[PDB]
Amino acid sequence: MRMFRITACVPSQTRIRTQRELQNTYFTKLVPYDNWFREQQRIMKMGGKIVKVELATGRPGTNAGLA
Amino acid sequence: SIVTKSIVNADAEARYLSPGELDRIKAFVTGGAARLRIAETLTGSRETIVKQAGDRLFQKRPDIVSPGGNAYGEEMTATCLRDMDYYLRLVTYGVVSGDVTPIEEIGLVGVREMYRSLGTPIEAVAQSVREMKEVASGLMSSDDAAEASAYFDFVIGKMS
């Protein structure tokens, strides 16, 4: 379905959480294409740095058959 | 191990392994001699225990060894003996460790999927483990029998 895999480092800017937090502070996930824009907007607004992103699944510029 | 389970729980709660768990670890480490001794007992008598367990299981469920059943062939029966040997060794591992984490990480997670892919009657396997537990309880002495029976019927319930 032309998913995206992203590595993003999201710091904590308001709260000092006392339990382990690498799993959500520095993570690489697989994001669907439709939700990629919303996810990236959310990450930037939360203040994380998008270290890397790549179209792991799908083919670039597919004029048809992208699902 | 009991220490590993306590560490996991304390980490989940962001704790320092409170005295209610530290005393338990202390008691386990002090009493480990009995657990070790039960370990050598089961290791020494593994062959016989597996043999009577298989005998009782076949008596209760002869169909599994029947040609229609999975255990027929004199090699499927050997494979049942082998799986009982694995389960006995796992129970020994759990007894020496102090908790069921090695038990579930070796032979309980996905056991249903394994026995479905092999066609095996997992409930029959649970009955076989019950027979193994009864044989071991008869072979050992009371409190040791209950200590092993904790892991045994844990495996029984998980298999069921």
Binding site: I16 | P19, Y93, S97, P102
Partner: protein, 161 residues
Amino acid sequence: MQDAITAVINSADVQGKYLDGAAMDKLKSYFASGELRVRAASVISANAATIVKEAVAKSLLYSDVTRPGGNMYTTRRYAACIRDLDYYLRYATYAMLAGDASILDERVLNGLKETYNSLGVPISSTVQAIQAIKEVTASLVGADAGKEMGVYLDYICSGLS
């Protein structure tokens, strides 16, 4: 995660054989060490915050790290350092109690280096704080338990390096 007990059990299980004399020797050695391990863990639990206090005081306080321009500047970053040192102390205690430094690998060092590089945390200052924590814990819990904690703390600092 694996302790000494789980390491022995895995060494036996990879060969798929019941425990033998060597396994019993390893298990009884760990059982002998368990008394010291539990006592050191209990004392560190009792006075963990204090240990971080002296470690940070003698390692980073009144320095460029805490001064403006240093990564320990601002109350948020200072609290982040305090919590990170609490992390290191707690996980070192976990590793000491278990007898194996695998919890540090799969729960501390897993992405810690990359996270520190991305966020700008100074690895050298973190290592110095780790050494200070090791010294304080050794002086507080004695010689044998001190070395036991120090080996895991050095493991963490090397993994950071």
